[PDB]
Design an enzyme around this catalytic site. Sequence first.
Site, PDB file in Angstrom:
ATOM      1  N   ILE A 170      -5.841  -0.402  11.473  1.00 56.31           N
ATOM      2  CA  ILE A 170      -6.930   0.526  11.736  1.00 56.31           C
ATOM      3  C   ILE A 170      -8.207   0.029  11.066  1.00 56.31           C
ATOM      4  O   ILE A 170      -8.177  -0.753  10.100  1.00 56.31           O
ATOM      5  CB  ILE A 170      -6.570   1.950  11.271  1.00 56.31           C
ATOM      6  CG1 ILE A 170      -6.208   1.961   9.787  1.00 56.31           C
ATOM      7  CG2 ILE A 170      -5.428   2.511  12.101  1.00 56.31           C
ATOM      8  CD1 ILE A 170      -6.049   3.350   9.207  1.00 56.31           C
ATOM      9  N   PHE A 194      -5.693   5.877   1.005  1.00 60.81           N
ATOM     10  CA  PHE A 194      -4.810   4.734   0.820  1.00 60.81           C
ATOM     11  C   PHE A 194      -4.954   4.175  -0.588  1.00 60.81           C
ATOM     12  O   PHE A 194      -6.073   3.949  -1.060  1.00 60.81           O
ATOM     13  CB  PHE A 194      -5.111   3.632   1.843  1.00 60.81           C
ATOM     14  CG  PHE A 194      -4.706   3.980   3.245  1.00 60.81           C
ATOM     15  CD1 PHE A 194      -3.381   3.906   3.633  1.00 60.81           C
ATOM     16  CD2 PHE A 194      -5.653   4.373   4.175  1.00 60.81           C
ATOM     17  CE1 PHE A 194      -3.004   4.224   4.923  1.00 60.81           C
ATOM     18  CE2 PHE A 194      -5.281   4.692   5.468  1.00 60.81           C
ATOM     19  CZ  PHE A 194      -3.955   4.616   5.842  1.00 60.81           C
ATOM     20  N   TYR A 246       0.817  -1.202   0.000  1.00 60.12           N
ATOM     21  CA  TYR A 246       0.000   0.000   0.000  1.00 60.12           C
ATOM     22  C   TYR A 246       0.856   1.259   0.000  1.00 60.12           C
ATOM     23  O   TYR A 246       2.069   1.223   0.219  1.00 60.12           O
ATOM     24  CB  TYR A 246      -0.938   0.022   1.215  1.00 60.12           C
ATOM     25  CG  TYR A 246      -0.242   0.316   2.525  1.00 60.12           C
ATOM     26  CD1 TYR A 246       0.374  -0.697   3.247  1.00 60.12           C
ATOM     27  CD2 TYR A 246      -0.211   1.603   3.046  1.00 60.12           C
ATOM     28  CE1 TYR A 246       1.011  -0.436   4.444  1.00 60.12           C
ATOM     29  CE2 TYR A 246       0.424   1.875   4.243  1.00 60.12           C
ATOM     30  CZ  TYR A 246       1.032   0.851   4.939  1.00 60.12           C
ATOM     31  OH  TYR A 246       1.664   1.115   6.131  1.00 60.12           O
ATOM     32  N   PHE A 250       2.550   9.949   3.875  1.00 60.60           N
ATOM     33  CA  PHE A 250       3.006   9.662   5.228  1.00 60.60           C
ATOM     34  C   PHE A 250       3.438   8.221   5.441  1.00 60.60           C
ATOM     35  O   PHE A 250       4.163   7.953   6.406  1.00 60.60           O
ATOM     36  CB  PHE A 250       1.911  10.015   6.250  1.00 60.60           C
ATOM     37  CG  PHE A 250       0.727   9.085   6.224  1.00 60.60           C
ATOM     38  CD1 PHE A 250       0.687   7.962   7.036  1.00 60.60           C
ATOM     39  CD2 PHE A 250      -0.346   9.336   5.386  1.00 60.60           C
ATOM     40  CE1 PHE A 250      -0.399   7.109   7.011  1.00 60.60           C
ATOM     41  CE2 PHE A 250      -1.435   8.487   5.357  1.00 60.60           C
ATOM     42  CZ  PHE A 250      -1.461   7.373   6.170  1.00 60.60           C
ATOM     43  N   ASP A 251       3.023   7.291   4.585  1.00 61.45           N
ATOM     44  CA  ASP A 251       3.398   5.891   4.721  1.00 61.45           C
ATOM     45  C   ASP A 251       3.308   5.226   3.357  1.00 61.45           C
ATOM     46  O   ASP A 251       2.456   5.576   2.536  1.00 61.45           O
ATOM     47  CB  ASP A 251       2.504   5.162   5.731  1.00 61.45           C
ATOM     48  CG  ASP A 251       3.185   3.959   6.349  1.00 61.45           C
ATOM     49  OD1 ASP A 251       4.414   3.817   6.181  1.00 61.45           O
ATOM     50  OD2 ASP A 251       2.490   3.153   7.004  1.00 61.45           O
ATOM     51  N   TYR A 274      -7.579   6.697  13.715  1.00 64.07           N
ATOM     52  CA  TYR A 274      -6.798   7.505  14.649  1.00 64.07           C
ATOM     53  C   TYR A 274      -7.627   8.544  15.397  1.00 64.07           C
ATOM     54  O   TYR A 274      -7.099   9.250  16.263  1.00 64.07           O
ATOM     55  CB  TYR A 274      -5.633   8.183  13.920  1.00 64.07           C
ATOM     56  CG  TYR A 274      -4.452   7.266  13.698  1.00 64.07           C
ATOM     57  CD1 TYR A 274      -3.928   6.518  14.744  1.00 64.07           C
ATOM     58  CD2 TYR A 274      -3.866   7.141  12.445  1.00 64.07           C
ATOM     59  CE1 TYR A 274      -2.853   5.677  14.552  1.00 64.07           C
ATOM     60  CE2 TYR A 274      -2.788   6.300  12.243  1.00 64.07           C
ATOM     61  CZ  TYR A 274      -2.287   5.570  13.301  1.00 64.07           C
ATOM     62  OH  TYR A 274      -1.214   4.731  13.112  1.00 64.07           O
TER      63      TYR A 274
END
Lengths: 107, 592, 434, 186, 263
Positions: A56, A99, A26, A36-37, A82
Amino acid sequence: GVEIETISPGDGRTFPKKGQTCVVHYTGMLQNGKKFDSSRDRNKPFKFRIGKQEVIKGFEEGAAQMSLGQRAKLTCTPDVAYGATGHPGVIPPNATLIFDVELLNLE
Amino acid sequence: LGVAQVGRMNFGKDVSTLKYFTICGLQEGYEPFAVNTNRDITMWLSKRLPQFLQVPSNHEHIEVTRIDGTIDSSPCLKVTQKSFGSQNSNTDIMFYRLSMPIECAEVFSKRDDYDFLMQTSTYYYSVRIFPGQEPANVWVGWITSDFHQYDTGFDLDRVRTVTVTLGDEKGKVHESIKRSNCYMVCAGESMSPGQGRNNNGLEIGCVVDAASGLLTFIANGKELSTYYQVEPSTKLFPAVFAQATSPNVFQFELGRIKNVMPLSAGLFKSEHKNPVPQCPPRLHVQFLSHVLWSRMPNQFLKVDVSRISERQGWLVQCLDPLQFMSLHIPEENRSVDILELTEQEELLKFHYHTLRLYSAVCALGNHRVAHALCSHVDEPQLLYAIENKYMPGLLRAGYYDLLIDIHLSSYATARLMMNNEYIVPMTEETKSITLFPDENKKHGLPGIGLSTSLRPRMQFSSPSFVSISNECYQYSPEFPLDILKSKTIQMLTEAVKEGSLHARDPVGGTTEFLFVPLIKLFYTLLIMGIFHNEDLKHILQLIEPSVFKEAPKEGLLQMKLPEPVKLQMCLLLQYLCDCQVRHRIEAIVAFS
Amino acid sequence: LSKKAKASTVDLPIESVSLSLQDLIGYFHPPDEHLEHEDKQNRLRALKNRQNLFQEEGMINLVLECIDRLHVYSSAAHFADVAGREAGESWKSILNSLYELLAALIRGNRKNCAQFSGSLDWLISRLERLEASSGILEVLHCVLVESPEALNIIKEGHIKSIISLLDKHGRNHKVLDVLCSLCVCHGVAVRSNQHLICDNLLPGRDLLLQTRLVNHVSSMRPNIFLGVSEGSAQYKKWYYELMVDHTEPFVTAEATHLRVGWASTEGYSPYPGGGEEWGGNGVGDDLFSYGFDGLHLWSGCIARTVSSPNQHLLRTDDVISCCLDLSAPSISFRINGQPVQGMFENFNIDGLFFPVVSFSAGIKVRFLLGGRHGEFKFLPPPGYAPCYEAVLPKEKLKVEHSREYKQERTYTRDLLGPTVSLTQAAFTPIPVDT
Amino acid sequence: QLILLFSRTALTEKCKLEEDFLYMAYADIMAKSCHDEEVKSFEEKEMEKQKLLYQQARLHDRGAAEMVLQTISASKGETGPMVAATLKLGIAILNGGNSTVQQKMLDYLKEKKDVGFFQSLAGLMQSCSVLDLNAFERQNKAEGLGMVTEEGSGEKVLQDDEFTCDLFRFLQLLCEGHNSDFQNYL
Amino acid sequence: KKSSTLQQLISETMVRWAQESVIEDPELVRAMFVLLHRQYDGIGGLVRALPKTYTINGVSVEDTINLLASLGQIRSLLSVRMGKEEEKLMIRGLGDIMNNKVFYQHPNLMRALGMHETVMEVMVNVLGGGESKEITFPKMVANCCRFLCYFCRISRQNQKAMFDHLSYLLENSSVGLASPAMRGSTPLDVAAASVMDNNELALALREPDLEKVVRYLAGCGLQSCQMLVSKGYPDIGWNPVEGERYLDFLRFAVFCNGESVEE
């Protein structure tokens, strides 16, 4: 809470099921477009197991709704991701997470 | 190069390419410009597209003065032209912008009252067209970051617009969306009463509703017909375009009208709930100009074009990946190549201190902070920073130190802490250990052999942010060590065999920048013990060929090194001697 | 002056204070590095004894009182109105000299920084002031680097105040240096300070410059320049096709970029405008280009999703047909022969239009320009014309890089100056008055 | 360069004389190089004297005397292994009553006006240890109990006899040769 | 003519650098001469290394590794400043060390590793932080003192190691005297465990430390406990709670193994 739109189609008959690990590869981005990821950055496919609170919520339901080999865009509202406390140092409070997720394989 | 002119420079990278150097200039003593350089010289050229930059204090035509907000008057920025009233004064459309943008809502909705003022997202600024300045020559409104259009004459019709119409299956227009970089109005058409603006005022008020995205303009207390609807997440800059006919032309005012949040609250996150108008030093007037430099990339994409056939048609193919680092300025919403920081000094120094701050926050085993910083500075960025030749030396050293601190520093420190004390288990391999590899008394290559002494375990957590487990924050973040090992060895070999040539341009600009980060990363890897067998053999060959040759060229020792690199090699020799001592201890235990 | 006595009645020794401040700053001056080592040691000893004697006599508190009683007046004009014109002129210089004297007195003295730890809270309260920001930052840096006790005194509110100074006053590297000193002092890391500085400064991503690796994107265009003007012999409807012979979704970590559509030049110049010649920008990243990626319509670096039967990102064996209608500004796309439920309309038509495709690495696509150059797998919509017709009779149609510079040898590279406008691109016969 | 580094470290201002393994080891090395330690004839006696003079010259030409004086002064009257090594080095360089080294030390002391050297000397001589009947009786009682001694030397009485002898030999070497000016200066 | 060995190569390159260039960097000069002296004194390396060397059988490899990891955590936490999470980390690490069997089985390895020095360094930091205003993080001092007392009771040579530091403990003898349930967790108790049941150590005891203990006891007799009167106990002149612990330390000093040390 999570809405899914397909970037690439999958087989459409194989879906995630109880006790089966999902291998997803991902890329995570904020709603404004800042990354961010990303598992593609680390070159390690991400493995998580359904129904055991490992990831999550919005990610879990998006992966469940996805099919094998399907690349889809996942939009997670703050409630399913979150909350309002946010992730310290990475995710700002009350942030919508986008995502790009691909379900490579299911063992 | 003039209009319709083509020319080439040959800097003498290959002497044979220089056509007439042998005929003239060779015997006199002049040298080619790129005779000693190992890399093609980066070539800079004038930028075609103008970009907004702050008005210089010495700008001969336009001057900007800041008036501090009094108790009764809002903070104000006044633009005046010094050149006017004299010859050589420039009469042309001058484009002005405020530095920071107002951000619209990510998702749009479906005595001033304190509650409404607090809850509202509406922001306001006004400009006062001074007496004697033609209102028709002045345009007031908002511009986005895409506004790079500079022309001698600006008309509101020329503004670049596009309408994206999305339809259903039947074709009905469920959304028709107008997009433009410029959202501005003209004071000349704004004035209804006529000439009498020089009496006082001509205040043109700009009202933006971030929640709804509605842009409305007020003029002398009446709502103008012009109104603009912008897309969600649009960043709008306060901008006034004016052709100056007076020494005093227009004045930004940061005041607030009834029930409207002032501009400072929208601009600054800290003052989001502060109703008092503010003009912090960050906010400043920016003007469009063509005095800028563009950097031509050292390497371009391999694109191959050909006509396959009458049948097939033209084919365009690109199969090799080329990737570059982009540094994104947050307030100006523009991204530049970080290799331009070679010539942008201020951004270079700020980014170096930012890298130092990252190292400080992740320093001394702050694994959670290291995991957090893994998001901001990623693995591909770190690897490209390590390997790229043209990057500035300061950023090179900062990125090397950041990589070490995030990934290697903790375990390297732990092994350095265990270096002094030796705990040797009693095992078959321990008994097998001997002082000398063979019968004849020749020392084995240091660091190569069987070591049984107890040593800290290498354990790394995998950075990931979709996961909610708290075990990851404990342990250092994971980095691919084989790739780092191979790249370190390869670039060390390149640096060694280039430094002997003594090129004019080392990687990073100086020999210190070339070697100290590389030798530091290499020393950290050696301390961690990632190097094994043939890799360490190549390492020893690079350090010194003759002494460490397994049974001319000068190694890293005999190359006239600078003092910091000398200190690094002293540390390396310390570690090698420590390895020899450890081998001696193991052999003593084996005999014992 | 605070009790509002008459200006002449009160004696304000402005010149003597300024000169004494200058002399004291020179008197507390660090040794120069080029000096011999033993002389440097003597001068350092003298400076340390000077600082110790001054601190024992309590000079720091007197300096702080002077600083506060000057800070009670907000601005130089305000102080001039209160006292007088020369006092207003000298106010800023006197404040700066006092802050510099405080920094010199406390710099390098562990004991002095230890006593200033208690009063440091008062110092931070004036950080936001523009007149005192630099001096307060210098004093804070000295105190933090010397005394760990003041580092313990520092709290979350003060850290937020420093970060707010970074926000309000712009990018100043001394703020970052102070933050590093807060994080680590004397080889000892403060975990609380590190965590707070991280959790406040970093997640916002609004002050620190943000870095990313971006795939290089190049643009690929034919020779044809298509413009519509009043009284010109230019047909207003056009059509071409592109098929993705091969594509790799992820050659690198970032997704492969592939956008196809029409672009417009700025004015009548052949050079495409509005976009940087090299970078990650492609079709639809500026308002002069109009692109389709298979899922979104790209214009002005803004993407909006478009619906289509079996909508997907552009992949292998996809035939993309782009239609340009300049009678009424319209750009429409059809994927695999099926209509795409979207258009670009009411755009600027001043400049010439040309086909263009923007791509990162790992592609293989082919232009079907119609007629001889290419063949149309799907029949053009009625009223539209193949793009190969727009070629001028004398010239030949190639697909050439839209930007001037390509990969080649550095010396063989042709540096191009400004190009002449394409007046002959649009043929307008103007009547001669008779 | 090594001598200059040690001299600069000694001249550096600090409350303690921080223990330096490098200083102690290299001071011991240089002292052993200097001293380099059947009736000898006059020829070979003068031989050994010239050889010792050359060995001492190799150091005091480079600043060994200044090293010794600075280290003793920076000791600030505290006994330590560094002070003992410095005293041994001074003994090595001054052995035989070296007039040149005595003159250099006197000139250096007079020109620096170093009161710290003599204050440290007084402190060291005050802190020098002597025989202790109490410690002797405690050791004898431990032996009578028969408990195994931890240190066979039993150095508790006369804690630093070698250091005391080195210090007084240093003073004697400084005053050797009837160096009247230095005798009065002490 | 080739050096053919690392020692000769290092000696040649150090001497060559030094003779080529005057070196402005004191750290570089120091490291160079340290390396040269290391090369010339090969014996000194073994002299320093062999005391640190320890031998364990293959049975104890796993728990030795775990204990070394715990000690590494404790050591790494020295560089970090004291805090709540740091306090929890110290306590958990010391608990693991005391739980592990190797701590009991191999005291000599443990002295060679020198945990006692590290633990007292932690305690020194804790006490030096806010000593006048009562020791912040009292659980730190309690756990450290308990660990050091167990270390004392482990072996007789450990009493050597702890008695080597007796001067500092008796200096900070008034850390947790007043607080109950801190008994066995005070530096005074660490000193008492160091000097307990050891005739050699009782004999090695000096006079000035005894004078300091007597002065502390006299101060306790002269003045009451400010902390106790702050809690609200009636203010009688003298202080039995802190007097008794000093008396116990004096008892351990004077009386050992059923016989009175008469000196």
